[PDB]
Symmetry: C5
Subunit: 205 residues, 5 copies
């Protein structure tokens, strides 16, 4: 049975990858859903106006080409694969000051409806003036995320909620979160889309 279930999974992976994606186009556009889980504000450097965040970046999209019928593959409804084995979106912070550091494996989960969920943990340094962090009102910084090379005609971006997930925020961080929002923005001949991460924070008093 286990031999058969393994064989089924190997067969599924082969048919989807080997017996056949060039990325989205205006004729075949994709929607990427983005969500942040903020874990920690590690450092806020007033000498350079750089702040360092650690977060999980949840990315989800769906491809017709990743759809299968579970009945054809021993009731398998999902599988895991290295993110290097599939196309992934070029979602980038627009105002980072150092290359993003990847903290987790980079493995995606593919479901039989064609949906892909990819949640890399990252540490990001970005442009931020932390003046006011030691006051009741705190400091506010923001950073936009979006595709580097695809317009809104090829990749639409969206959020499921504008409330950043703070359920995993480190309780003993040097900084307390007053608010954290993630808001889709459209800028205008093709539309350009980003998600603006806005964090208000202050010294844990």
């Amino acid at each position: 049975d286990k031999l058969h279930s393994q064989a089924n999974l190997m067969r599924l992976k082969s048919d989807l990858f080997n017996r056949s994606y060039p990325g989205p186009t205006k004729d075949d556009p994709l929607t990427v859903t983005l969500g942040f889980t903020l874990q920690d504000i590690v450092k806020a450097d007033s000498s350079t106006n750089e702040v360092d965040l650690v977060y999980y970046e949840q990315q989800r999209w769906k491809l017709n080409s990743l759809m299968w019928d579970p009945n054809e593959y021993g009731n398998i409804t999902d599988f895991r694969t290295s993110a290097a084995d599939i196309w992934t979106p070029d979602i980038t912070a627009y105002s980072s000051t150092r290359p993003v550091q990847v903290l987790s494996p980079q493995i995606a989960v593919v479901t039989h409806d064609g949906s892909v969920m990819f949640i890399p943990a990252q540490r990001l340094s970005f442009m931020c003036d932390p003046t006011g962090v030691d006051s009741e009102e705190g400091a506010t910084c923001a950073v936009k995320f979006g595709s580097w090379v695809y317009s809104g005609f090829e990749i639409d971006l969206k959020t499921d909620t504008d409330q950043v997930d703070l359920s995993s925020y480190y309780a003993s961080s040097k900084y307390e979160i007053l608010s954290a929002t993630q808001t889709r923005q459209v800028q205008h001949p093709e539309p350009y889309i980003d998600v603006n991460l806005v964090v208000k924070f202050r010294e844990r008093r």
Copy 2:
């Protein structure tokens, strides 16, 4: 003699043939219909740094991982009584066990080579330096600071990867005697948790270390 020389060549041939049969002739990872149990254990070697400016602590440890696969089994009698072999971890599937609250990418300090035994068991023990979220307030006190970090599969839920420990006591037999920090206690405990992100329970091992300035 020549016989002994031949026996060495045969031994090499048998090992090359075993590795070929296991890897070349014939694992896509665990599934709900074939879940895998990974045993984890930590050997803490040193608390290198406890940074109160950022609430990051840096640990050096060996992370022992064990699992067993039917697909790595062989009969030693078919292979010159070979009972185990060493192979680059890149040659086999390995679990995606990750710290949940690191603050910098984990750094690997050792070769990444696994030992595979004829019963299909694998043992893999990478040495790592990890920076993780920890408030070291109280490190300059009798009772010390207490920090914790969860380790588990990144992408497999408890439907596919289960974890276990052999003991809840961290191996402190190799702890650096002249570290800046002395260890008061170090435990490793399996936990089953749900996250609002996702409907399936994930398993982790929670490493909890209580330490103070020496």
Copy 3:
């Protein structure tokens, strides 16, 4: 229309295969077949100015544009595809280098180019660069001035020529709360004669005048 989508992917896959697999990699420019690369900078931030080492760290987007006959197609042969995105590793890219960096440049963005059916390519890497700069005067009204040349490392002006669209650096994305304010930022094509080499190299000289924000 799910089939029109399938047809559009097939057409793009076929185009890329034709340009990349059923055609051999462009060997780079030569004196018989020189290339003009258009360069433009968008300065985002002066992050750090180190007076102990005389190094300054910039974050910028470097726009590169060139055109190759070998990347041309007829859109009518490929379902009216007029352009596509592809990893910059799939195509030749120019070896444009800062001539006075003090650390390897760090890439901040995906390295993906846009190729258009007339054979034109646009590639816009975001970078952090440390370069040689004495920031003396940064704490004064007149500020500090530093300069850095960008150009091909190995191709002379007989092989790679450069041009700009304007000599004004794009400051429309400069971080408003930077520690440093920009007084001026220019980008100027130069023909550079080096005593080592009989052929001159073309560069774009980026000159930035800046001061500590008030």
Copy 4:
């Protein structure tokens, strides 16, 4: 041209026409000789109890599968090749605190008797309390090196001398070397019956005056 052809033929014969060496085993064990040449103690950090060393690590071993008759190859007696082209031992510091950094090319010299000499230059941070370094008596630290995954029944270790080579130690280092030894140790765990082998590098050092 014939000398070049002879060498290309030798390498092809050794690397293409004859099987892989799969590493040592209980039935085909290997002796690895280790020696250190200490070049500099760069940094001794008393805030973290880490010391940084720069050294050359000489490794030697011999394989029947790397032997040839020079007479068959225009009297070539040795050659140099990328260490990636051949099996190399997984010799590791046991108490490093950062990944070792390689400072040189990693190229092995193979001799016709099957012996291999591989001498990477390395910078290593390791666990060390430098207390006493600002005293006449100095500080003492130690680090063990050995195979990560092979027991003494698969890889034995040996030194040619127990004196660390100090002939290349940097004359204007912040630290002077009082002594440096490299000593083979055999330990037996309760886990297992086979012996486990390391070479313990012990350095006594003090701030230069």
Copy 5:
């Protein structure tokens, strides 16, 4: 058409040299190689008196010649030279002997090959090396030195030479924290008591002081 034939000729040349020959196995006693080395010092970035490490930025010019890289330009549309990734060809294992961190490469690594088989390769590098900067804040300044040479080849396999013993200072950064008093690059033949073979290095000696 002229340009298509020129590209075709170049693609054919590279194919013939690389794709269609057995890889050059490096020099030997019977087929020794001369490598010419020269340095262009661009900046002393940092001089650390707490660890006695100094950081230099320099261009390292390397030139050698291989018969296996020769061609008759008449057979290839009169192409006389080309540029190629340094990873496409053998390069000499020239290394600093007293670095303290891995050298960092600042430029592309692309070589120029000429029809006579000569190769020119000039990587820009940042190097940290062992240096006591005592005296840097004095009129006499400090003096440091670092040897460069093959890691594994003797003087009977790789000879090193310089064209000049004067380091190229023409591109030295005029506003560096440190000014250069002198910089020389001297070929040295070293013997080791083990072995009768000569071993060759180029000793880079820099005298410098705070500007």
